[PDB]
Amino acid sequence: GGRLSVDASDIAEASRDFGGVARAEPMAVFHPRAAGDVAGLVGAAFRSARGFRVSARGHGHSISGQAQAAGGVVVDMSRGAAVARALPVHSAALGGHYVDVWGGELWVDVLNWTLSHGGLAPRSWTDYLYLSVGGTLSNAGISGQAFHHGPQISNVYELDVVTGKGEVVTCSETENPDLFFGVLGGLGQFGIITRARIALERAPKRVRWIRALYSNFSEFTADQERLISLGSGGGRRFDYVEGFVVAAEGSSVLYCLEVTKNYDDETAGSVDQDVDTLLGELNFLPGTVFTTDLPYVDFLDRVHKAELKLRAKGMWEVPHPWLNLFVPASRIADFDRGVFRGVLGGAGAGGPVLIYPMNKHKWDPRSSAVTPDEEVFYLVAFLRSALPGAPESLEALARQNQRILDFCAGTGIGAKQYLPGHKARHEWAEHFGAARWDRFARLKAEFDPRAILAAGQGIFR
Ligand SMILES: *Cc1cc2c(cc1C)nc1c(=O)[nH]c(=O)nc-1n2C[C@H](O)[C@H](O)[C@H](O)COP(=O)(O)OP(=O)(O)OC[C@H]1O[C@@H](n2cnc3c(N)ncnc32)[C@H](O)[C@@H]1O
Ligand SMILES: NC(=O)c1ccc(OC(F)(F)F)cc1NC(=O)Nc1cc(Cl)cc(Cl)c1
């Protein structure tokens, strides 16, 4: 059903990622038509003498070759129009809607499909929609909704997985749960997601998108932490909570609180009051509230608009040495002094520095995802890009990232890397901890004994 390609453009694409650093080339690119084709190719790798590497590629948004299969085969999971798509379904047993999507589908295409078929949409997002479903579900998938709905791995009912033995398995909390929870946040280690059954809600029509400035980090974090505790026994709450660190030019640094209030035709009459009520309880700098009103799709697609402006300036295809950390809330204050003011004090081509807290209880502890041992933790995202055609810019950013990691290590901050870029066995053991490493290695022994899948992650050999 599927086809092997040796087209130089296909090989070049499969040999690179958004990070722009790791460049391991495969022998060929496989374009599947359906799940059985993926099963066939993985089956052949498993049965082969050498046991060649097989990695699925979503949209290639990896930072450090996580989707590369050195001298093996990259499965181009991007099918898209040609194949039939499942319509959203309502279930009286689940008390809501779901949709079956191909593992290679992009979230932007999923959104467009569910909106045009019942005005439905997933409840938990990423900031960027040009990512595959299989790709984000292999990590966590987080944005401003995760504090309330949990990550995208907490909003999936079932999967079809092609294991490292080329077997197709349907799994959920009730059927083959070890494979289901193993795959979720599993870094592609136990199989290729060919189908994901995504939870849906009735989509809002519009968004009231707010930004407010803070000079005091203690007031900023206290407000972020109070906002993510809202929504217990009904109660007024924002639908999205993010934040970012800003340089004063163009205190020494400012913190931007970013919130949204989702609304439709029924709630349009109470949106202005709900926003004013929630904002009154906050301690942002007076006269720094910036408001926008726009369609739900336009809000969710905001980062794609930033991308088009970057492509127009030749600033998109540059190295992206992006570092993502999960920081226990008990150590966030020290993080500001030492990193935002310390390491970063005094940015290459520039880029955002995201910061926002999440609730651990919205993350299922049975999944493979690694979070800090604290109820409240922050994502701290260093999304700074190198200058185009300037290798020294990438080196300076890489030294800054190592200084941030050294700062966390040296002060005993129990931070965990999100999209971990570890490569040494002792680094992976430390990342997971004894209990989780033991569950991870056992799942690997069972579902990918020859370590065929997602070898670019550099965990097993
Ligand atoms: C580039 C980027 C990434 C990004 C983002 C914005 C941009 C500009 N915003 C994010 C956000 O707000 N929140 C978040 O949680 N992540 C965000 N990211 C990072 C993104 O999630 C990751 O890059 C992730 O890898 C998904 O991207 P993509 O779909 O392109 O996947 P990949 O890089 O090719 O593959 C990643 C790993 O997973 C394995 N893989 C790929 N597809 C599958 C399937 N179907 N089944 C199993 N494993 C799969 C790859 O082999 C690799 O190990
Ligand atoms: N405001 C944003 O949100 C954003 C803006 C610009 C942008 O720069 C780009 F235009 F170049 F794309 C990227 C953004 N956001 C993310 O990229 N978010 C993210 C990325 C990873 Cl790798 C992990 C996690 Cl958790 C979040």
Coordinates of C-alpha atoms and ligand atoms in Angstrom, one line a residue:
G1 CA 0.0 0.0 0.0
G2 CA 2.8 2.4 1.0
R3 CA 5.8 3.6 -1.0
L4 CA 9.6 4.0 -0.2
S5 CA 11.1 7.2 -1.5
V6 CA 14.8 8.2 -2.1
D7 CA 13.8 11.7 -3.5
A8 CA 16.6 14.1 -2.3
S9 CA 13.9 16.6 -1.0
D10 CA 12.3 13.8 1.0
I11 CA 15.7 12.7 2.5
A12 CA 16.7 16.3 3.2
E13 CA 13.4 17.0 5.1
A14 CA 13.6 13.6 7.1
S15 CA 17.2 14.5 8.0
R16 CA 16.4 17.8 9.6
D17 CA 14.0 19.4 12.2
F18 CA 12.9 22.8 13.5
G19 CA 15.9 22.7 15.9
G20 CA 18.2 23.0 12.9
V21 CA 21.2 21.2 14.6
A22 CA 20.8 17.3 14.5
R23 CA 21.1 16.0 10.9
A24 CA 21.1 12.2 10.9
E25 CA 20.1 10.9 7.4
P26 CA 17.9 7.8 6.8
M27 CA 18.2 5.3 3.8
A28 CA 14.6 6.1 2.7
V29 CA 11.3 7.9 3.6
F30 CA 8.1 5.8 3.8
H31 CA 4.8 7.3 2.8
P32 CA 2.0 5.1 4.3
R33 CA -1.6 5.0 3.0
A34 CA -3.0 3.4 6.2
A35 CA -2.0 1.7 9.5
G36 CA -1.3 -1.7 7.9
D37 CA 1.4 -0.2 5.8
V38 CA 3.2 1.2 9.0
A39 CA 2.7 -2.3 10.6
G40 CA 4.3 -3.8 7.5
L41 CA 7.3 -1.6 7.5
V42 CA 7.9 -1.9 11.3
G43 CA 7.3 -5.7 11.0
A44 CA 10.1 -5.9 8.3
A45 CA 12.5 -3.8 10.6
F46 CA 11.7 -6.2 13.5
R47 CA 12.2 -9.4 11.4
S48 CA 15.4 -8.0 9.6
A49 CA 18.9 -9.2 10.6
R50 CA 20.4 -5.7 11.3
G51 CA 17.1 -4.3 12.8
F52 CA 17.1 -0.9 11.0
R53 CA 15.8 2.2 12.8
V54 CA 12.2 3.3 12.1
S55 CA 10.9 6.7 13.3
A56 CA 7.7 8.5 12.6
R57 CA 7.9 12.1 11.6
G58 CA 4.9 14.4 12.5
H59 CA 5.6 17.9 11.2
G60 CA 9.4 17.8 12.1
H61 CA 9.1 20.2 15.0
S62 CA 11.7 18.4 17.2
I63 CA 14.6 20.4 18.6
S64 CA 17.3 17.8 18.6
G65 CA 16.7 14.9 16.1
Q66 CA 14.0 13.1 18.1
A67 CA 12.3 12.1 14.8
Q68 CA 15.5 11.1 12.9
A69 CA 16.3 7.5 12.0
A70 CA 20.1 7.3 11.2
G71 CA 20.6 5.0 8.2
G72 CA 17.0 3.6 8.7
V73 CA 13.5 4.7 7.6
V74 CA 11.6 7.9 8.4
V75 CA 7.8 7.3 8.2
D76 CA 6.3 10.5 6.8
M77 CA 3.1 10.4 8.8
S78 CA 1.8 13.5 6.8
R79 CA -0.8 12.0 4.5
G80 CA -2.5 15.3 3.7
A81 CA -8.3 15.0 0.9
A82 CA -7.2 11.6 -0.6
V83 CA -8.2 9.4 2.4
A84 CA -11.6 9.4 4.2
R85 CA -11.8 11.1 7.6
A86 CA -14.0 9.9 10.5
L87 CA -16.8 12.3 11.5
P88 CA -17.1 13.4 15.2
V89 CA -19.3 11.0 17.3
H90 CA -21.5 11.5 20.3
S91 CA -21.4 8.9 23.1
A92 CA -24.1 8.7 25.8
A93 CA -21.7 6.5 27.9
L94 CA -18.9 9.1 27.9
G95 CA -21.3 12.0 28.1
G96 CA -19.7 13.8 25.2
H97 CA -18.2 13.8 21.8
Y98 CA -14.9 12.4 20.3
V99 CA -13.2 12.2 16.9
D100 CA -10.9 9.5 15.4
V101 CA -7.9 11.1 13.7
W102 CA -4.9 9.6 11.8
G103 CA -1.7 9.9 14.0
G104 CA -0.1 12.2 11.3
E105 CA -3.0 14.7 11.3
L106 CA -2.1 18.3 12.2
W107 CA -4.1 19.9 15.0
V108 CA -5.0 22.8 12.6
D109 CA -6.7 20.3 10.2
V110 CA -8.3 18.5 13.2
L111 CA -9.8 21.9 14.4
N112 CA -11.1 22.8 10.9
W113 CA -12.7 19.3 10.5
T114 CA -14.5 19.2 13.9
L115 CA -15.7 22.9 13.6
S116 CA -17.2 22.2 10.2
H117 CA -18.9 19.0 11.6
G118 CA -21.0 20.1 14.5
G119 CA -19.0 23.1 15.7
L120 CA -17.0 20.9 18.0
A121 CA -13.3 21.2 19.0
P122 CA -10.6 19.6 21.2
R123 CA -10.5 21.2 24.8
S124 CA -6.7 21.2 25.4
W125 CA -4.2 22.8 22.9
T126 CA -0.6 23.6 22.1
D127 CA 0.3 27.3 21.2
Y128 CA 1.1 26.1 17.7
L129 CA -1.4 24.0 15.6
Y130 CA 1.0 22.9 12.9
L131 CA 2.0 19.9 15.0
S132 CA 0.9 16.3 14.5
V133 CA -1.5 14.5 16.9
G134 CA 1.0 11.6 17.4
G135 CA 3.9 14.0 17.9
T136 CA 2.2 16.0 20.8
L137 CA 0.6 12.9 22.3
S138 CA 4.2 11.3 22.5
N139 CA 5.2 14.4 24.7
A140 CA 2.1 16.0 26.5
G141 CA 0.7 18.9 24.5
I142 CA 0.4 22.0 26.7
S143 CA -0.9 25.6 26.4
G144 CA -3.0 27.9 28.5
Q145 CA -5.9 25.3 28.9
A146 CA -3.7 22.6 30.5
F147 CA -4.3 24.0 34.2
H148 CA -8.0 23.2 33.8
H149 CA -8.3 20.4 31.2
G150 CA -4.9 18.8 31.6
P151 CA -2.4 18.3 28.8
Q152 CA -3.6 16.7 25.4
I153 CA -2.5 13.3 26.8
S154 CA -5.3 13.7 29.5
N155 CA -7.9 14.4 26.6
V156 CA -7.6 11.1 24.6
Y157 CA -9.9 8.1 25.0
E158 CA -8.2 5.5 22.8
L159 CA -5.4 4.8 20.4
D160 CA -4.3 2.4 17.6
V161 CA -0.6 1.7 18.1
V162 CA 1.8 -0.1 15.8
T163 CA 4.3 -1.5 18.3
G164 CA 8.1 -2.1 17.7
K165 CA 7.1 -5.7 16.7
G166 CA 4.8 -4.4 13.9
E167 CA 1.7 -5.5 15.7
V168 CA -1.4 -3.1 15.5
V169 CA -3.0 -2.7 19.0
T170 CA -6.2 -0.9 20.1
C171 CA -5.6 0.5 23.6
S172 CA -7.4 2.6 26.2
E173 CA -7.7 2.8 30.0
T174 CA -9.8 -0.5 29.7
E175 CA -8.0 -2.4 26.9
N176 CA -4.2 -2.9 27.0
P177 CA -3.8 0.0 29.5
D178 CA 0.0 -0.5 29.9
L179 CA 0.5 0.2 26.1
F180 CA -2.0 3.1 26.2
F181 CA -0.5 4.9 29.3
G182 CA 3.0 3.9 28.1
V183 CA 2.6 5.5 24.7
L184 CA 1.1 8.8 26.2
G185 CA 4.2 11.0 26.9
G186 CA 6.3 7.9 25.8
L187 CA 8.6 9.7 23.4
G188 CA 7.7 7.3 20.5
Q189 CA 9.5 4.5 22.4
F190 CA 6.7 1.8 22.5
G191 CA 5.0 2.3 19.1
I192 CA 3.6 4.6 16.3
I193 CA 0.2 6.2 16.9
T194 CA -1.9 5.5 13.8
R195 CA -5.3 6.6 15.4
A196 CA -6.1 8.8 18.3
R197 CA -9.6 9.2 19.6
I198 CA -9.7 12.9 20.7
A199 CA -12.1 14.3 23.3
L200 CA -14.2 17.2 22.0
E201 CA -16.4 19.9 23.5
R202 CA -18.9 22.4 21.9
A203 CA -16.5 25.1 20.5
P204 CA -16.8 28.7 21.7
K205 CA -17.3 31.1 18.8
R206 CA -15.2 34.0 20.0
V207 CA -12.4 34.9 22.4
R208 CA -11.8 37.9 24.7
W209 CA -7.9 37.9 24.6
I210 CA -6.3 40.0 27.5
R211 CA -2.6 41.0 28.3
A212 CA -1.6 42.9 31.5
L213 CA 1.9 44.0 32.7
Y214 CA 3.7 43.4 36.1
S215 CA 7.0 44.7 37.3
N216 CA 6.7 42.6 40.6
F217 CA 7.5 38.8 40.0
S218 CA 5.9 37.9 43.4
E219 CA 2.6 39.5 42.5
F220 CA 2.8 38.1 38.9
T221 CA 3.3 34.5 40.1
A222 CA 0.8 34.9 43.0
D223 CA -1.8 36.0 40.4
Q224 CA -1.0 33.2 37.9
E225 CA -1.2 30.7 40.9
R226 CA -4.6 32.1 42.0
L227 CA -6.0 32.1 38.4
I228 CA -5.2 28.3 37.9
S229 CA -6.9 27.4 41.3
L230 CA -10.3 28.9 40.0
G231 CA -13.0 26.6 38.7
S232 CA -14.2 24.5 41.7
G233 CA -18.0 24.1 42.0
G234 CA -18.7 26.2 39.0
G235 CA -17.2 29.6 39.6
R236 CA -15.9 32.4 37.3
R237 CA -12.6 31.5 35.6
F238 CA -10.5 32.3 32.6
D239 CA -10.3 29.6 29.9
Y240 CA -6.6 30.2 29.2
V241 CA -3.6 31.2 31.5
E242 CA -0.2 31.9 30.1
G243 CA 2.6 34.4 30.7
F244 CA 5.9 35.7 29.3
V245 CA 9.0 37.6 30.4
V246 CA 9.6 40.9 28.7
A247 CA 12.7 43.2 28.4
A248 CA 11.9 46.8 29.6
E249 CA 13.5 48.5 26.5
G250 CA 11.4 48.6 23.3
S251 CA 11.8 46.9 37.2
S252 CA 14.6 45.8 34.6
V253 CA 12.2 43.1 33.3
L254 CA 8.5 43.0 33.0
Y255 CA 6.1 40.0 33.2
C256 CA 3.1 39.8 31.0
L257 CA 0.0 37.9 32.2
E258 CA -2.0 36.5 29.2
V259 CA -5.6 35.3 29.7
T260 CA -8.7 34.6 27.7
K261 CA -12.4 34.3 28.2
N262 CA -14.2 32.1 25.7
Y263 CA -17.8 32.9 24.7
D264 CA -20.6 32.1 22.2
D265 CA -24.0 33.6 21.3
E266 CA -25.5 32.5 24.7
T267 CA -22.7 33.9 26.9
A268 CA -21.9 37.1 24.8
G269 CA -24.1 39.2 27.2
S270 CA -22.1 38.3 30.3
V271 CA -18.5 38.2 28.8
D272 CA -17.7 41.9 29.6
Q273 CA -18.9 41.6 33.2
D274 CA -17.1 38.2 33.8
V275 CA -13.8 39.7 32.5
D276 CA -14.1 42.9 34.6
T277 CA -15.0 40.9 37.7
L278 CA -11.9 38.5 37.3
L279 CA -9.6 41.4 36.4
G280 CA -10.6 43.5 39.5
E281 CA -9.3 40.7 41.8
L282 CA -5.8 40.9 40.1
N283 CA -2.7 43.1 40.9
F284 CA -1.4 44.0 37.5
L285 CA 0.1 47.5 36.7
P286 CA -2.8 50.1 36.2
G287 CA -3.2 51.2 32.6
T288 CA -1.4 48.1 31.1
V289 CA -4.5 46.0 30.1
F290 CA -4.5 45.3 26.3
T291 CA -7.7 43.6 24.9
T292 CA -8.5 41.9 21.6
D293 CA -11.8 40.3 20.5
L294 CA -11.5 37.7 17.7
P295 CA -12.8 34.4 16.4
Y296 CA -11.8 31.2 18.3
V297 CA -9.9 29.8 15.3
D298 CA -7.9 33.1 14.9
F299 CA -6.9 33.0 18.6
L300 CA -5.8 29.3 18.3
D301 CA -3.9 30.1 15.1
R302 CA -2.0 33.2 16.5
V303 CA 1.5 31.6 16.4
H304 CA 1.1 30.6 12.7
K305 CA 0.6 34.4 12.0
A306 CA 3.9 35.1 13.8
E307 CA 5.5 32.3 11.6
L308 CA 4.3 33.9 8.3
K309 CA 5.9 37.3 9.4
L310 CA 9.2 35.4 10.2
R311 CA 9.2 33.5 6.8
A312 CA 8.8 37.0 5.1
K313 CA 12.1 38.1 6.8
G314 CA 14.0 34.9 6.3
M315 CA 13.9 34.4 10.1
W316 CA 12.0 31.1 10.3
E317 CA 14.6 28.6 8.8
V318 CA 17.2 29.5 11.5
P319 CA 18.6 27.2 14.4
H320 CA 16.1 27.0 17.3
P321 CA 18.0 26.0 20.5
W322 CA 14.7 25.9 22.5
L323 CA 14.8 24.8 26.1
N324 CA 11.6 23.8 28.0
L325 CA 11.6 23.2 31.7
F326 CA 9.0 22.2 34.3
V327 CA 9.9 24.1 37.5
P328 CA 8.4 23.2 40.9
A329 CA 6.4 26.3 42.2
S330 CA 8.3 26.2 45.5
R331 CA 11.5 27.2 43.5
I332 CA 10.1 29.6 40.9
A333 CA 11.1 32.8 42.9
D334 CA 14.8 31.8 42.9
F335 CA 14.4 31.0 39.2
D336 CA 13.7 34.8 38.5
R337 CA 16.6 36.2 40.4
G338 CA 19.1 33.6 39.0
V339 CA 17.8 33.2 35.4
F340 CA 15.5 36.0 34.1
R341 CA 17.7 38.7 35.9
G342 CA 20.9 36.6 36.3
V343 CA 21.7 34.4 33.2
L344 CA 19.5 36.3 30.7
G345 CA 20.3 39.7 32.3
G346 CA 22.2 42.1 30.0
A347 CA 18.7 37.0 22.8
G348 CA 20.2 36.2 19.3
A349 CA 17.4 37.0 16.8
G350 CA 15.1 37.2 19.8
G351 CA 12.1 35.0 20.8
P352 CA 9.6 34.5 23.7
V353 CA 10.3 33.4 27.2
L354 CA 7.1 31.7 28.3
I355 CA 6.1 31.1 32.0
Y356 CA 2.9 29.8 33.5
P357 CA 1.8 27.3 36.2
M358 CA -0.2 24.1 35.8
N359 CA -2.0 21.6 38.2
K360 CA -0.4 18.2 38.5
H361 CA -3.7 16.5 39.4
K362 CA -4.8 17.1 35.8
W363 CA -1.9 14.8 34.6
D364 CA -2.6 11.1 34.9
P365 CA 0.4 9.5 36.9
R366 CA 0.1 6.2 34.9
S367 CA 1.3 8.0 31.7
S368 CA 5.0 8.1 30.7
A369 CA 5.1 12.0 31.1
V370 CA 7.6 13.3 33.7
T371 CA 6.5 16.2 35.8
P372 CA 8.1 17.6 39.1
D373 CA 7.0 16.1 42.5
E374 CA 4.8 19.1 43.4
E375 CA 1.1 19.9 42.9
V376 CA 1.8 23.2 41.2
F377 CA 4.7 23.5 38.7
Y378 CA 5.5 26.0 35.9
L379 CA 6.5 25.6 32.3
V380 CA 9.5 27.9 31.7
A381 CA 10.0 28.0 27.9
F382 CA 13.2 29.6 26.5
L383 CA 12.2 30.0 22.8
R384 CA 15.1 32.1 21.6
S385 CA 16.3 31.7 18.0
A386 CA 19.8 32.1 16.6
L387 CA 20.6 34.9 14.1
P388 CA 20.4 33.7 10.4
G389 CA 23.7 32.4 8.8
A390 CA 25.5 33.2 12.2
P391 CA 26.8 30.0 13.8
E392 CA 28.3 32.0 16.9
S393 CA 24.7 33.1 17.7
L394 CA 23.6 29.4 18.2
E395 CA 26.8 28.7 20.3
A396 CA 26.1 31.7 22.6
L397 CA 22.4 30.5 23.1
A398 CA 23.7 27.0 23.7
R399 CA 26.0 28.3 26.4
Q400 CA 23.1 30.2 28.0
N401 CA 20.9 27.0 28.1
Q402 CA 23.8 25.0 29.7
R403 CA 24.1 28.0 32.4
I404 CA 20.3 27.6 33.1
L405 CA 20.6 23.8 33.5
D406 CA 23.8 24.3 35.7
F407 CA 21.8 26.9 37.8
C408 CA 19.0 24.4 38.4
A409 CA 21.5 21.6 39.3
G410 CA 23.7 23.8 41.5
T411 CA 20.8 25.1 43.6
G412 CA 18.9 21.8 43.8
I413 CA 15.9 22.9 41.8
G414 CA 14.0 19.7 41.0
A415 CA 13.2 20.9 37.5
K416 CA 12.4 18.4 34.7
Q417 CA 13.0 18.9 31.0
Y418 CA 9.9 18.8 28.8
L419 CA 10.8 17.4 25.3
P420 CA 13.9 16.0 27.1
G421 CA 17.1 16.4 25.1
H422 CA 19.2 14.1 27.4
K423 CA 21.5 11.6 25.7
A424 CA 23.5 9.8 28.5
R425 CA 22.0 6.8 30.4
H426 CA 22.7 8.4 33.8
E427 CA 20.9 11.6 32.6
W428 CA 17.8 9.5 31.6
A429 CA 17.9 7.6 34.9
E430 CA 18.0 10.9 36.8
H431 CA 15.2 12.4 34.6
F432 CA 12.7 9.5 35.2
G433 CA 13.8 8.5 38.8
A434 CA 14.1 4.8 39.9
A435 CA 10.3 3.8 39.8
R436 CA 9.5 5.5 36.4
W437 CA 12.8 4.3 34.8
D438 CA 11.9 0.7 35.8
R439 CA 8.4 1.0 34.3
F440 CA 9.9 2.6 31.1
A441 CA 12.6 -0.1 30.5
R442 CA 10.0 -2.9 31.1
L443 CA 7.6 -1.3 28.6
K444 CA 10.5 -1.1 26.2
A445 CA 11.4 -4.8 26.7
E446 CA 7.7 -5.7 25.9
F447 CA 6.8 -3.3 23.0
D448 CA 10.2 -2.4 21.3
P449 CA 12.9 -5.1 22.4
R450 CA 15.2 -4.3 19.4
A451 CA 14.9 -0.5 20.1
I452 CA 13.9 0.1 16.5
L453 CA 11.5 3.0 17.3
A454 CA 12.3 6.7 17.8
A455 CA 16.1 6.0 18.4
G456 CA 16.8 9.7 17.8
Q457 CA 15.5 10.3 21.4
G458 CA 18.8 8.6 22.5
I459 CA 17.4 6.5 25.4
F460 CA 17.9 2.9 24.3
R461 CA 20.5 1.4 22.0
Ligands
LIG1 C1 8.2 23.8 16.4 C2 7.2 24.1 17.6 C3 7.0 23.1 18.5 C4 6.1 23.3 19.5 C5 5.3 24.5 19.6 C6 5.6 25.5 18.6 C7 6.6 25.3 17.6 C8 6.9 26.5 16.7 N1 4.4 24.8 20.6 C9 4.2 23.8 21.5 C10 3.3 24.1 22.6 O1 2.7 25.2 22.7 N2 3.1 23.1 23.5 C11 3.7 21.9 23.4 O2 3.3 21.0 24.2 N3 4.6 21.6 22.4 C12 4.9 22.6 21.5 N4 5.8 22.3 20.6 C13 6.6 21.1 20.6 C14 6.0 19.9 20.0 O3 5.0 19.4 20.8 C15 7.0 18.8 19.7 O4 8.0 19.3 18.7 C16 6.5 17.4 19.3 O5 7.6 16.6 18.8 C17 5.4 17.4 18.2 O6 5.9 18.0 17.0 P1 5.7 17.0 15.6 O7 4.3 16.7 15.3 O8 6.4 17.7 14.5 O9 6.5 15.7 15.9 P2 8.0 15.2 15.5 O10 8.9 16.3 16.0 O11 8.1 14.9 14.0 O12 8.2 13.9 16.4 C18 8.4 14.0 17.8 C19 8.8 12.6 18.4 O13 7.6 11.8 18.4 C20 7.7 10.7 17.5 N5 6.5 10.6 16.7 C21 6.0 11.4 15.7 N6 4.9 11.1 15.3 C22 4.5 10.0 16.0 C23 3.4 9.1 16.0 N7 2.4 9.2 15.1 N8 3.4 8.1 16.9 C24 4.4 7.9 17.7 N9 5.5 8.6 17.8 C25 5.5 9.7 16.9 C26 9.0 11.0 16.7 O14 9.7 9.8 16.2 C27 9.8 11.8 17.7 O15 10.5 11.0 18.7
LIG2 N1 3.4 33.3 22.0 C1 3.7 32.1 21.8 O1 3.3 31.1 22.4 C2 4.7 31.9 20.7 C3 5.1 33.0 19.9 C4 6.1 32.9 18.9 C5 6.7 31.7 18.7 O2 7.9 31.7 17.9 C6 7.7 31.2 16.7 F1 7.0 32.1 16.0 F2 8.9 31.1 16.1 F3 7.1 30.1 16.5 C7 6.4 30.6 19.5 C8 5.4 30.7 20.5 N2 5.1 29.5 21.3 C9 5.7 28.3 21.3 O3 6.5 27.9 20.4 N3 5.4 27.6 22.4 C10 6.0 26.4 22.8 C11 7.1 25.7 22.1 C12 7.6 24.6 22.6 CL1 8.9 23.8 21.7 C13 7.1 24.0 23.8 C14 6.1 24.6 24.5 CL2 5.5 24.0 26.0 C15 5.6 25.8 24.0

